[PDB]
Design a protein around this ligand. Structure first.
Ligand SMILES: Cc1cc2nc3c(=O)[nH]c(=O)nc-3n(C[C@H](O)[C@H](O)[C@H](O)COP(=O)(O)OP(=O)(O)OC[C@H]3O[C@@H](n4cnc5c(N)ncnc54)[C@H](O)[C@@H]3O)c2cc1C
Ligand SMILES: Cc1cc2nc3c(=O)[nH]c(=O)nc-3n(C[C@H](O)[C@H](O)[C@H](O)COP(=O)(O)O)c2cc1C
Ligand SMILES: Cc1cc2nc3c(=O)[nH]c(=O)nc-3n(C[C@H](O)[C@H](O)[C@H](O)CO)c2cc1C
Ligand code: FES
Ligand code: FES
Ligand SMILES: [Ca+2]
Lengths: 198, 446, 408, 387, 257, 204
């Protein structure tokens, strides 16, 4: 139990996907205007990561791993294309789920809904799992925790941007440039965990 | 009994004696166009026209059927208009005693009268304008009803009159107005008061509720927050006790009752007291020979929420029961922001004045500082007793976020509900105007 | 070689399994059933339509098309429809043209609604009665220097049911027109010769539609007349091609046939007892003439009314006989005309300058209750802005100000 | 000129509307009160820096070597020239003078550069210069080592004023602590001048660890002043007879200053109490768990209170109203988060001996979220018509 | 969608054809170029061995010629530090660490960690100044993703780390993994002792920068805690009893003659 | 003409106006050499992916389009990586830690979705080249400041002599962390929208 709690805390705080590792930044900077939109996107990203990491764990350990099927055969050059294919199929199903049941979020996401496939944090999590040689249970916990940390990051950014309705930002900075500055200050704040081993 | 803990009683000098005297002779009265929310007049008189008491002066384009009648009999001498021809006031010079007369009933038939008959009599007399709705503080539409009519029989405003002294002289009329209101409500009638005794109505749907504490315990918005929370689907009407006496008199005699009792108080008033006057009376004629020499500001209402009565606005407002006079503070003080402050009032404890209990202050119209951005040191939460997040709501109002403000409780509020927030603001924001702008937006897009 | 075969086979199998998993639950999340789109509403008279389309496209297919103006994208916003059951949310792009009170009633944009399930509409009965006509041109005379007067008649003795201030849509096919082919009398062709306007030409690749307002009133049986201005390129950009629809309508001659789509309701006069003030300038004479003639002749209203017209020169004024006859017949109508920049050959005596200034200086300044009367408006955008500013300074409310921005 | 008259005089305006009477308090009063509350800490800090330096110098050098050392440093020979002495029998006047030769140039540099930036932004955006930069500048000048270079001070105040406040619209319009943002800029840009063992005492060639670094190495038995050979006592750390950042050392002086602005109603007792709660809880949990290899586990809460920048941060930097939560429950949560974060960085992060500036900057990111949770509960209460 | 793209047959044909083409091209590229990639890696390893030895070379021909001439690999038993029989040039210590069920280390005898295994026989490179052995290059590795380096000592061992130190395989964060991309950091290792008078490991990665002229002290990596810690753990282990301890004891005693 | 390769540099920049290549802009911009190599790789891959997607755009079902696009993109990147490892080993060692970032660079997929799926093959190729140029503009500008102020070097060549090397310059350690890249991109956007006021976002 302590092993998995330690792994979950590490995934959420010590190796946050957004304010550490600085991954999945495009939708983090674009879709953080409203807390509720960011909350829905964070839930979707959590679901995608939590299914993707264990499925790719199984696929790597049963097919792509060296000597997994036949002695003397690698197939490890197919890792990246297999991983992105799994993620792409998942986001394909998620698209019709959101179209049927969550039209407001479907419309708010816009062109960024199909681009959840190349959210760098999800592919990076699958790659980190393969590098670290996790088990199936470790993969489930790790994908869940990475999603949770990414969602926490984007929801905090949306809360700041909502408090900033009282700000007076210069027009050349209004929106994207000030959001870039805000994310840099957030990274400063998150440098508190830099040298801890969990 | 509801006890309010958060709030403030302003320790301003010049409190009135709660004894009624006869005031000066009034030669001019007016109706002020800008004091009715969302009102666009249609004039029915012209300069030089003779009028009677309860004769219609103008009408509302945006609220069909609502009439604005003459408090007195006389002649129209001015129709003052401001920028973009906004109606400022219609001034009548008192002469004669002609009036419009309505139907009268006995005391035991008022509670069983028909709602349509009551509405017709009130609208024709012009007394219908005494009611205001929450939300938006407007005269109700003449075809609408309310399940909650709130009677304001207490006053926590600084230098205000004591409603008990006024009501005890007009007990029959107060009870008659309560009976008429009970017939008119279709829900309940809420008589919000203090712990002292008042005349009572025997109708089972008229209830007395006692409120205790400092200002704003005597405010109708506070009362509705605690007894009947208002929203877009739940609308309440408010009316003060002097208008209830007027309603009782109207239905008992068939005549419009325009006599008022106001307090003339303030740091520059020689003998603060209660005076008998008439609705819309001239404040220049009322405060004549009553004020110390110097530069002063006359206010219709209180120092917290009142109208600067100058020029075309120098008349008693429809919803005002007191007149405040105080000095104009224009001096530049060297290092006055850094003095110890033994004679400086604050809700903070950064001046020496709070160490002297029972001190009263000769307050002036100075802004004790410059306009700045909001740095929230916790002053708003000290004076605000309703279940809201005041800092977040006030920042919504400053930023112009009407949907967020409506979520946070702006629909429950009048401008008088944010007066203490305006008072204690270190950045010197005026929050009643921001609230009214938000409410205008919400109504226009609604 | 063995590893290559293993790689290709395994990757192909993995992709095939993933795609089969997608197709399953594509079959469960995406319905393929029929749609009971109740176009009529109360009698549940529906249309069979494949899902995934657009509401305005389905309406056009069923033939009960609505007043669309730009084909989609949320630009025009004139495709107003009322839905009481159907799409469960309103698109934020629609909110730029739909107020909260309108959305509470059920107003929506037809170009943004997605056909996903059954729905019911509450279109006004006017939409159910719209239909198509092919007209006969009686004359295409020229009334001003850049202004035409087109007259049409409906065959078989029928008259279109319309109200004053209404407008129709005229269809045009693909056609290349040269400016030299127009016919203009000698009085109004002096400026054309001076500026050498005949050297232009216009080309139409696909059929187009445009909206236009009538210049008559319902008592003009079986005759539809119009006022059309030439769409000449701006003088500051002489190398711009001229307009298409205006040039095509100009090219029409007596005896030719044209095809209109039916009356549409807009810019009506509210039935009150308030005084009416009609301010028009440029080519906005058609709605003013329709309103004024309707009021004085059809229902014979006794309301006090007046007309103020601002022209460019003495050559551009017309219908003067009609307005003088109306004023002589009825004492409740008085009209005045002004010129912005009269020519020395005009020899004019009377009001000059901008029409809003003339109106303010002659009538509105001394008016007792400007706010108590109704203003109807049709003219150039700058003149619209000027008169709106003047009326707002006088204290007139928006509800008492009515206009139709047809575009000068 | 207009610059002096605006600050010296009161505006002389009247109310135009609304409440015709106003409270006496204003932003200028608030800011100058917070500015004056750190004067005891600043005076003790100057005196303590001077005394630490003199003790270490006389520990290291003697006679002609000490004279040559004095002649080669302008701080030392200016103290000698203005009447003081660098000898071991120096008095409080000499110590305060030597500490002033270090504090005053840092503060002058910071004030001038940051004021230039504020004046530029106010002129371009056409507003009046307000107060708040007074508090920002004096706090930044007090949270640095005595030996800090002036060009680094200029860069840090520039980053804090421009990147954290002015680009968001100025005073009241930001979300992050400006002085702590400038300190973080220095921390991550030039570590060798704001950390280590050569930076916290202004004696030439002197190397010494400070109390939080010594406890991380050997517990309470490792706390020794090497300049004087004495063991550091709890009373020493509370009074402020220890090295470190200039204005941080005296918990007593900081407490005297903080009592006044808490009583005045300017600083939030709910925030301060939350910080205390979080600190005590986390340190006591570490004490109960224990450790055989990390001596930071057995440091109690009352030793956490008197070491590092904890008291300075809790009393003056977490109490910044603009960077904090705007609700009362949010204030409690915000403080508890700061206290937990500080003890956590002190104990389980070996990269940093302290965690207060990082902890407050971390909590600045989550204050709006606490407010959001509280406001959603309020909105649900409203929708239920309350009762 | 379009035409008959929604058809199951069309969808399946499209995806199957694309998969066939893409996987064929990818697999042919991956299997065809494996030998060239391995040769490139081997040449890069012979370089950086030359570079740590200080022998200047550039180009494949020059690198290969200077190798097999200035360097001769040897086997070491680790446990005793005695030389082992030949076939040193084609030894795969990385694979031998996993295969043959070779020594697995207890969690208390780790340090560098995430090694979890150890080849019973290691490989060292002796650089020859003609016929004599002037000094020896030691490959050591430790965690921090996976970091492999070339430690350099002289025949005296305790008293000189010669010509410096090079990392030939790491994957640390750029801008923070500046243990190789900065030759300034790599130059600080020249002249370090690796041991004290008591003959125990003494290399220290000093956080915040080592004092000037200090022995056994080398500056840490700024902003790269836990990578400096991995570097410290690497030497803590590989200088101990489970690593090159016995071998370096035989050296300075007569092992290299 | 060349009006299409130059629009996404300033008028429709993929990072300053669209938000599409941010992660690598934070990752690779500590060195100008790495930024240059990444610019070339992204430009080449986006051009070829756009071409191949437009070649078959009329046969792609809407329910497998993400799979089709990502299969093409991943195959191109993998083949390029293998070729670099076999023939350009040093450049490959530069890009090895970032190879997986090229696949999930949102520019490649976003241009395939936005443009290639509805445009002609040669225009799609040109669009990919132009968006790569706009990406490289930002990358090189950010990398210039980061490398010069964090190491006193440009393309590895000594420009500012360092104190450790007997010079006078002390490197800025914040320039080796991501927040500096965040701030540099924000200020670059400020300058661009100052010179191009049409790109200012509305206050509403
Ligand atoms: C309800 C309604 C009623 C109306 N009633 C009337 C009416 O009674 N009378 C009336 O005159 N108008 C009326 N209008 C205005 C209507 O838009 C007319 O159709 C108007 O004459 C437009 O001219 P057009 O369609 O011929 O040319 P347009 O298509 O509008 O084009 C003409 C303009 O576009 C420019 N242009 C043309 N081609 C190009 C090109 N390729 N590139 C760039 N610029 C180009 C021309 O230089 C010129 O400025 C009405 C509009 C509405 C909505
Ligand atoms: C408000 C404040 C916050 C500080 N925050 C940190 C910090 O986060 N990290 C750090 O290393 N030092 C920080 N310091 C500096 C240390 O507290 C202290 O002055 C210095 O490290 C002395 O070393 P010591 O920790 O051994 O006592 C801060 C100082 C102050 C006044
Ligand atoms: C009690 C109090 C504490 C403050 N603390 C700080 C602080 O720690 N840092 C700072 O830069 N400004 C501080 N200020 C000044 C000001 O509030 C701050 O710079 C705002 O964030 C400016 O918008 C403080 C002000 C007050 C009243
Ligand atoms: S490049 Fe867009 S999410 Fe990383
Ligand atoms: S067609 Fe343009 S808004 Fe509907
Ligand atoms: Ca090994």
């Amino acid at each position: 139990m302590e092993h998995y709690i330690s792994l979950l805390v590490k995934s959420i705080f010590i190796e946050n996907m957004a304010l550490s590792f600085f991954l999945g930044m495009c939708t983090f900077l674009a879709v953080s205007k409203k807390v509720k939109t960011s909350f829905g996107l964070g839930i979707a990203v959590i679901v995608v990561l939590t299914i993707s990491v264990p499925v790719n764990n199984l696929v790597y350990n049963l097919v792509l791993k060296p000597d997994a099927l036949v002695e003397g055969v690698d197939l490890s050059f197919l890792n990246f294309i297999t991983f992105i294919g799994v993620i792409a199929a998942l986001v394909q199903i998620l698209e019709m789920i959101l179209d049927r049941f969550f039209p407001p979020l479907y419309n708010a996401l816009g062109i960024f809904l199909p681009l959840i496939t190349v959210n760098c944090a999800i592919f990076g999590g699958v790659s980190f799992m393969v590098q670290r040689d996790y088990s199936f249970a470790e993969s489930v916990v790790y994908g869940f925790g990475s999603g949770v940390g990414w969602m926490l990051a984007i929801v905090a950014l949306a809360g700041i941007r909502e408090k900033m309705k009282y700000s007076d930002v210069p027009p050349g900075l209004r929106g994207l440039g000030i959001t870039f500055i805000t994310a840099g200050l957030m990274a400063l704040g998150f440098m508190s965990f830099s040298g801890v081993q969990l | 009994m509801i006890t309010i803990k958060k709030g403030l009683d302003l320790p301003i000098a010049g409190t009135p004696s709660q004894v009624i005297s006869d005031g000066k002779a009034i030669k001019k009265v007016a109706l002020l166009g800008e004091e009715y929310v969302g009102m666009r007049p249609t004039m029915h008189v012209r300069v030089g026209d003779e009028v009677k008491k309860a004769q219609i002066l103008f009408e509302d384009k945006k609220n069909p059927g609502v009439k604005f009648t003459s408090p007195v009999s006389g002649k129209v001498v001015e129709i003052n208009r401001g920028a973009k021809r906004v109606l400022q006031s219609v001034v009548i010079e008192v002469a004669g005693d002609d009036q419009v007369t309505f139907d009268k009933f006995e005391a035991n038939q008022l509670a069983s009268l028909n709602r349509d008959a009551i509405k017709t009599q009130l609208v024709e007399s012009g007394l219908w304008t005494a009611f205001r709705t929450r939300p938006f503080s407007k005269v109700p539409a003449i075809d609408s009803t309310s399940e909650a009519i709130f009677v304001t029989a207490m006053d926590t405003n600084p230098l205000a009159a004591e409603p008990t002294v006024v009501i005890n002289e007009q007990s029959e009329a107060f009870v008659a107005g309560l009976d008429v209101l009970s017939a008119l409500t279709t829900g309940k009638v809420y008589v919000c008061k203090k712990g002292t005794s008042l005349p009572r109505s025997q109708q089972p749907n008229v209830e007395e509720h006692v409120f205790d504490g400092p200002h704003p315990a005597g405010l109708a918005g506070t009362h509705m927050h605690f007894l009947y929370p208002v929203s877009a689907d739940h609308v309440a009407w408010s009316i003060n006790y002097q208008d209830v006496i007027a309603v009782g008199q109207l239905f008992l005699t068939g005549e419009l009752y325009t006599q008022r009792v106001v307090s003339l108080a303030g740091p520059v008033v020689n003998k603060p007291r209660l005076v008998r006057t008439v609705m819309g009376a001239s404040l220049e004629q009322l405060v004549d020979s009553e004020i110390m020499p110097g530069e002063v500001r006359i206010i219709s209402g209180s120092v917290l929420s009142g109208t600067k009565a100058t020029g075309p606005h120098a008349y008693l407002g429809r919803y005002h029961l007191q007149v405040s006079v105080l000095r104009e503070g224009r001096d530049k003080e060297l290092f006055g922001w850094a003095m110890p402050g033994k004679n400086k009032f604050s809700v903070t404890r950064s001046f020496l004045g709070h160490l002297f209990k029972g001190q009263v202050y000769n307050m002036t119209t100075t802004t004790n500082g410059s306009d700045r951005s909001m740095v929230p040191i916790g002053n708003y939460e000290k004076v605000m007793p309703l279940d809201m997040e005041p800092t977040l709501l006030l920042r919504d109002l400053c930023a112009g976020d009407s949907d967020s403000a409506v979520r946070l409780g702006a629909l429950e509020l009048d401008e008088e509900d944010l007066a203490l927030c305006t008072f204690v603001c270190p950045g010197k924001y005026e929050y009643g105007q921001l609230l009214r702008e938000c409410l205008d937006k919400i109504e226009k897009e609604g | 070689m063995s590893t290559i075969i293993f790689g290709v086979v395994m990757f192909t199998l993995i992709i095939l399994a993933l795609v089969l998993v997608i197709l399953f639950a594509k079959s469960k999340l995406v319905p393929t059933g029929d749609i009971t789109i109740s176009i009529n509403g109360d009698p549940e008279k529906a249309i069979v339509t494949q899902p995934g389309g657009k509401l305005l496209t389905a309406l056009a297919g069923a033939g009960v098309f609505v007043s669309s103006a730009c084909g989609g994208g949320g630009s025009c916003g004139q495709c107003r429809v009322k839905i009481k059951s159907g799409g469960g949310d309103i698109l934020p792009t629609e909110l730029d043209h739909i107020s909260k009170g309108e959305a509470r009633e059920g107003e929506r944009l037809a170009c943004q609604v997605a056909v996903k399930a059954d729905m019911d509409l509450e279109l006004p009965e006017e939409i159910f009665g719209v239909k198509k006509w092919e007209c006969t041109v009686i004359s295409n005379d020229n009334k001003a220097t850049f202004i035409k007067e087109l007259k049409l008649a409906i065959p078989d003795g029928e008259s279109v049911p319309f109200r004053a201030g209404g407008y129709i849509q005229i269809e045009a096919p693909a056609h290349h027109v040269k400016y030299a082919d127009f016919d203009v009398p000698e009085k109004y062709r002096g400026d054309w010769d001076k500026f050498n306007l005949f050297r232009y030409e216009s080309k139409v690749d696909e059929p187009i539609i445009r909206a236009y307002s009538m210049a008559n009133y319902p008592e003009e049986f079986g005759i539809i007349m119009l006022n059309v201005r030439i769409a000449t390129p701006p003088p500051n950009n002489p190398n711009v091609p001229p307009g298409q629809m205006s040039s095509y309508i100009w090219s029409l001659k007596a005896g030719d046939k044209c095809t209109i789509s039916g009356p549409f309701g807009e810019f009506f006069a509210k039935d009150t007892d308030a005084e009416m003030v009609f301010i028009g300038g440029g080519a906005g004479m058609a709605p003013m003439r329709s309103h004024i003639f309707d009021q004085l002749k059809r229902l014979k209203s006794k309301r006090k009314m007046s007309y103020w017209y601002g022209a460019r020169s003495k050559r551009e004024m017309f219908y003067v006989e009609d307005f003088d006859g109306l004023a002589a017949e009825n004492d409740n109508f008085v009209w005045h005309c002004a010129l912005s920049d009269p020519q020395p050959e005009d020899n004019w005596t009377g009001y000059t300058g901008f029409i809003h200034n003339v109106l303010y200086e002659n009538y509105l300044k001394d008016h007792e209750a400007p706010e108590d009367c109704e203003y109807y408006m049709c003219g150039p955008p700058m003149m619209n802005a000027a008169v709106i500013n003047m009326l707002k300074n006088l204290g007139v409310e928006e509800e008492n100000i009515l206009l139709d921005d047809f575009g000068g | 000129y207009e610059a002096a008259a605006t600050l010296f005089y009161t505006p002389g305006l009247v109310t135009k509307r609304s409440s015709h009477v106003r409270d006496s308090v204003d932003l200028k009063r608030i800011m100058i009160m917070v500015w004056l509350a750190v004067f005891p800490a600043m005076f003790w800090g100057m005196y303590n820096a001077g005394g630490q330096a003199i003790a270490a110098l006389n520990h290291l050098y003697s006679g002609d070597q000490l004279a040559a050392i004095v002649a080669g440093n302008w701080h030392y020979w200016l103290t000698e020239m203005l009447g003081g002495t660098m000898s071991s029998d120096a008095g409080w006047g000499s110590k305060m003078l030597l500490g002033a030769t270090y504090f005053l140039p840092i503060y002058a540099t910071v004030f001038i550069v940051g004021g230039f930036w504020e004046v530029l932004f106010c002129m371009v955006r056409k507003h009046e210069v307000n107060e708040g930069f007074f508090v920002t500048s004096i706090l930044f000048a007090l949270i640095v080592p005595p030996t800090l270079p002036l060009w680094q001070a200029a860069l840090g105040i520039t980053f804090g004023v421009v990147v954290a406040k002015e680009v968001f619209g100025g005073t009241g319009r930001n979300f992050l602590n400006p002085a702590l943002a400038g300190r973080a800029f220095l921390f991550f840009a030039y570590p060798a001048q704001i950390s280590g063992d050569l930076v916290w005492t202004a004696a030439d060639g002197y190397s010494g660890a400070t109390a939080l670094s010594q406890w991380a190495q050997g517990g309470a038995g490792a706390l020794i002043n090497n300049a004087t050979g004495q063991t550091i006592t709890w009373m020493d750390a509370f009074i402020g007879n220890i090295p470190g950042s200039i204005g941080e050392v005296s918990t007593l002086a900081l407490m005297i200053g903080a009592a006044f602005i808490v009583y005045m109603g300017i600083a939030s007792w709910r925030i301060i109490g939350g910080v205390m709660i979080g600190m005590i809880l986390l340190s006591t949990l570490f004490n109960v768990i224990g450790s055989d290899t990390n001596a930071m586990f057995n440091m109690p809460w009352h030793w956490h209170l008197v070491l590092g920048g904890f008291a300075f941060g809790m009393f003056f930097m977490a109490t910044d109203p603009v960077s904090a939560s705007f609700t009362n429950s949010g204030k409690w949560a915000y403080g508890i988060l700061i206290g937990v974060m500080c003890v956590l960085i002190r104990v389980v992060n070996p990269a940093y001996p302290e965690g207060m500036m990082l902890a407050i900057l971390f909590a600045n990111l989550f204050a709006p979220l606490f407010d959001h949770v509280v406001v959603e509960r309020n909105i649900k209460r409203r929708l239920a018509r309350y009762g | 969608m379009a035409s008959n793209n929604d058809s199951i047959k069309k969808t399946l044909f499209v995806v199957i054809a694309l998969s066939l083409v893409c996987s064929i091209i990818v697999s042919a590229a991956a299997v065809g170029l494996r030998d060239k990639q391995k040769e490139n890696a081997a040449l890069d390893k012979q370089s950086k061995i030359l570079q740590v030895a200080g022998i200047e070379a550039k180009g494949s021909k020059q690198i290969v010629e200077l190798f097999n001439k200035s360097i001769e690999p040897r086997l070491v038993d680790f446990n005793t530090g005695d030389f082992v029989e030949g076939d040193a040039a084609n030894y795969d210590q990385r694979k031998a660490a996993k295969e043959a069920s070779e020594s697995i280390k207890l969690t208390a005898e780790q340090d560098k960690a995430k090694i979890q295994r150890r080849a019973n026989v290691g490989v060292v490179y002796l650089v020859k100044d003609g016929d004599k052995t002037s000094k020896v290059i030691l490959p050591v590795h430790g965690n921090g993703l996976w970091s492999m380096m070339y430690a350099f000592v002289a025949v005296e061992t305790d008293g000189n780390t010669v010509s410096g130190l090079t990392y030939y395989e790491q994957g640390e964060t750029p801008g923070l993994g500046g243990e190789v991309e900065n030759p300034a950091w790599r130059a600080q290792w020249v002249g370090k002792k690796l041991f004290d008078e008591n003959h125990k490991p003494a290399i220290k990665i000093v956080k915040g920068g080592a004092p000037q002229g200090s022995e056994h002290g080398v500056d840490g990596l700024s902003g790269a805690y836990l990578t400096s810690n991995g570097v410290q753990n690497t030497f803590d282990f590989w200088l101990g009893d489970m690593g090159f301890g016995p071998f370096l004891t035989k050296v300075r005693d007569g092992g290299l003659n | 003409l060349k009006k299409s390769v130059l629009a996404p540099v300033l008028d429709n920049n993929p990072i300053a106006l669209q938000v599409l290549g941010v992660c690598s802009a934070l990752a690779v911009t500590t060195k100008l050499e790495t930024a240059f190599v990444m610019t070339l790789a992204v430009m080449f891959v986006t051009a070829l992916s756009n071409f191949f997607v437009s070649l078959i755009r009329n046969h792609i079902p809407n329910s497998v389009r993400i799979i089709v696009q990502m299969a093409i993109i991943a195959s191109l990147v993998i083949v390029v990586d293998q070729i670099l490892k076999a023939y350009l080993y040093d450049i490959s060692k530069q890009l090895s830690v970032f190879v997986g970032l090229i696949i999930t660079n949102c520019i490649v997929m976003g241009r395939a979705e936005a443009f290639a799926m509805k445009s002609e093959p040669i225009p799609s190729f040109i669009d990919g080249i132009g968006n790569g140029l706009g990406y490289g503009f930002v990358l090189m500008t950010v990398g210039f400041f980061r490398e010069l102020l964090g190491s006193g070097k440009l393309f590895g060549l000594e420009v500012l002599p360092l104190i450790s090397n007997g010079g006078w310059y002390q490197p800025n350690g914040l320039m080796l962390l991501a927040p500096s890249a965040f701030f540099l991109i924000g200020f670059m956007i400020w300058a661009i929208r100052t010179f191009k006021p049409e790109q200012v976002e509305a206050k509403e």
